[PDB]
Amino acid sequence: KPVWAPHPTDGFQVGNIVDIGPDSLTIEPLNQKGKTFLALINQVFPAEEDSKKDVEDNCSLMYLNEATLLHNIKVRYSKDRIYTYVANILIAVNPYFDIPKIYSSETIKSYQGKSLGTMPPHVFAIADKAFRDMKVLKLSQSIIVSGESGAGKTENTKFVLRYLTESYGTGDIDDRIVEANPLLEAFGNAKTVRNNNSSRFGKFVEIHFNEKSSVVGGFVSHYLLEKSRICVQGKEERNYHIFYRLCAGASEDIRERLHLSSPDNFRYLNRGCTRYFANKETDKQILQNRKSPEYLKAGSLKDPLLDDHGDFIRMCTAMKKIGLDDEEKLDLFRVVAGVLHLGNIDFEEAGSTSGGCNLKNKSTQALEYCAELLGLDQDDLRVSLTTRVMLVIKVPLKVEQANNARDALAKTVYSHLFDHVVNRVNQCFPFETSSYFIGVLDIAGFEYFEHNSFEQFCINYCNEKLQQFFNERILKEEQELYQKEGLGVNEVHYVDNQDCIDLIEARLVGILDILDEENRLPQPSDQHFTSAVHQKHKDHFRLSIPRKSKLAIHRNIRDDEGFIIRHFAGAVCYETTQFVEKNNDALHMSLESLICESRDKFIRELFELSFISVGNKFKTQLNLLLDKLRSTGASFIRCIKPNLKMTSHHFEGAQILSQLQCSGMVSVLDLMQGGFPSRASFHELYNMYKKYMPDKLARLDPRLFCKALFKALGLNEIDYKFGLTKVFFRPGKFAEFDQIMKSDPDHLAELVKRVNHWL
């Protein structure tokens, strides 16, 4: 009988064991009567007998191992079924094209009120299950969407919000919650090499409900907008979409008023890719004077979803749908164009004269446009960017320092604009009180590149905490409940990642605190910071020096120029240059005073050793989020990126297997095969049917009424198990378990009626 054996790029391959030896197996790959190869015994797995079949729940497999899990998800993917369960946890493999109709209004309605198992695996079923648990358990809910960059977290987050608003919404508040997202994507999403539409901030979106489970409003929390991208990008990346939507789609009147032109004309865009997303037809809708030479030569960027011209139109519709007037819209655009012009203010050395620098003569217009759009005096701005009062005098800044002042001001203005946008979105659906919420979490996903800096460190830190919460809720607490209730479920061990979080966040000697301490030294040094990190974490399993990397490009990074963190999702080598200055969130007073005293009302509203730790601010925000998550029932969607090329129909087995392992899903499948995802207490069950019980039943102890109710309901006893205080149901029995929990008086009387008859 055929088995699964290792394969370097497919993960596993199918063959037959043809001989066995001391500590190995000899495998003959299917249809290769010649060749054999050797495999360790613990690396060969039994395979499903039918290789073309799939099951909707991986718990239903004959053999439950990492190789069968991989293959089952693959067979489904090959048939455009991107969703599969492991009990009540959803696995979602990015298709990288739009599969027709699977998100239609019709499909939405078909999922309404259905139990897990009675419809195909779908994100819609996860959302419905959260709404039902909310209602029945009287308990706010959270849906955690996880995965690496480009796995599909954001698309799925939008499917959940759409499902919930369409299904349980009022029937104009809905739409508003949905249209908020494309609006925030404009300001906080950008092309990176992993994702054409990468989220460069984390979000938690809360749909709030009253006592009768009707939507009363929403609330969007936002976490750590990436700042450095505002000013510079790698050549295959872009700044936030809004810059290119505006350049591509603005009317000529708007382009004139804001002095826009093709993206190559702005420093804050032109180190990056200056090409638009467009297809053959949308290209023709963009005026020639918006196109860069790079665009004219190389043509447009292709994407199934993004279209800068078409996305500008949609973003303006979305603004009008949530209630921004044309004045608010133009204000947003003006500040955006002001940031652009700000970045064109360039500096040349003037050491022999002032000892500092002057503006380059060519930057004259930029200074003018910037000052006009930001309502500042040209001279005030000139002076704030080229000089600074210090300790007493007023000293001329060097060229490098003026650049930093220019960029720090640009980062803060744009950051405050983004903050204003998110707040404006919460204003479009406020509420004074609510009973529960369903929150959906969508973070920036695990990412690494040839060069990794502070941005990737913060982002991967946030993925680390999330994975830990999954471990806590699913692998730890679940096993603690089985034990506490005496179920004798075989313990499953796993590698935990709390040590990685400690390395980062522990008091005084965590990376975040060591970095903070560096910012407060007289001579802050990235090198000094990094040495201290290595020194205080000797032999720590999650830390290494860069030269131990598996990649050659890292071989020449000195010990004090970076470190490797061994994240749950994999080793990442960070280069520490700029960590110190990137960790400071504080804007110097001169620049703050400059922008707070703008002539423009709107800009004033943006703003209502100086050092504010970005790292510890972020930590504090995430711990509060986690406290909120712990106070809820949690559902999990694990997104999987099938390949490194953004193509459809290219399942990379080894890449996918690696993510199934790192996400803990192989461990979960192991625990679940003999676990009990559904349960409720004997007493609460009894107490709920009590008032409908004739005396013959009421007299039974709670436990024995349950046995009667289950036996009357045709329920087989392989399918459940009585613990100390709770009864537990196995995977595949969600429908049967939901019928038992149904609290509808007609339903309760009907089941009691069935028990009476059964006696």
Ligand SMILES: Nc1ncnc2c1ncn2[C@@H]1O[C@H](COP(=O)(O)OP(=O)(O)O)[C@@H](O)[C@H]1O
């Ligand atoms: N279910 C899906 N259907 C169609 N396209 C998808 C789906 N999920 C992801 N994609 C594509 O993959 C890209 C990346 O998805 P996204 O949700 O932005 O990833 P993440 O947020 O996890 O980094 C999307 O912009 C879209 O093109």
Ligand code: VO4
């Ligand atoms: O590419 V992502 O939206 O995980 O940041």
Ligand SMILES: [Mg+2]
């Ligand atoms: Mg996203």
